[PDB]
RNA sequence: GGUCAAGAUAGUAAGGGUCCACGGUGGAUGCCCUGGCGCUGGAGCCGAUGAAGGACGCGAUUACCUGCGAAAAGCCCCGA
């Protein structure tokens, strides 16, 4: 999900979570410019997930520092 | 009526002229507003927490614009 699946997980996972999200994003690219990339959405969605992840580790790391 | 004689005037337009009909060119005029212009009133500073203003980037296809900043036409929270 968007709220309930990120803040339950710890950041040492986030680093390599980011990492794998990237990796798939990259292979996706290679596909795209190789053709055909029949599911363009998946790209932007992975973007969305990434932005989520970082927003999360950020707000969190700074709210645990209270 | 044919010949000859004397004398007179017609029509053709290569082209042009005036008018008429019919288009072409051009974009005046009328209408319209998606843009202005002034007056009244309101509001009036930004920035070392990086300003105004940019450069390069972010798109399934992206040259211009717009939005954005490698979390990149967007990301989290609340409210309509
Ligand atoms: Mg002639
Ligand atoms: Mg631009
Ligand atoms: Mg909302």
Read off the DSSP letter of residue A38: S
State both tokens at A28.
């996706």
Q: Into how many domains does chain A fold?
A: 1
Nucleotides of B strand lying within 7 Å of any protein CB atom: 59-61, 71-77
Task: Give distance CA A47 / C1' B60 (Å).
Answer: 14
d(CA A8, CA A22): 21
Give resolution in angstroms: 3.0
Question: Quick one: DSSP state of residue A36?
Answer: -
Answer for A58: CB within 7 Å of strand B: yes
**Interacting residues of A43 by C-beta distance below 8 A, sequence separation 6+:** A25, A28, A29, A32, A37
Q: Which two tokens stand for residue A33?
A: 């410019």
A38 touches strand B (CB under 7 A): no
Alpha-carbon span A55 to A33, nearest angstrom: 29
Strand residues in chain A grouped as ranges (E): none
Say yes or no: Cβ of A43 under 7 A from any atom of strand B. yes
Q: Cα separation of A1 and A40, whole Å?
A: 21
Count other C-beta atoms under 10 Å from residue A57's C-beta: 19
CA dist list (Å): A39 to A27, A28, A35, A55: 13, 9, 11, 25
Q: A66 is in which domain, residue-wise? A: 1-66
């Amino acid at each position: 999900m968007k709220p309930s699946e990120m803040r339950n997980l710890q950041a040492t996972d986030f680093a390599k979570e980011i990492d794998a999200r990237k990796k798939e994003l990259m292979e996706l690219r290679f596909q795209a410019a190789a053709g055909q990339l029949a599911q363009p959405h998946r790209v932007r969605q992975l973007r969305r997930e990434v932005a989520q992840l970082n927003t999360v580790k950020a707000e969190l790391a700074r709210k645990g520092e209270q």
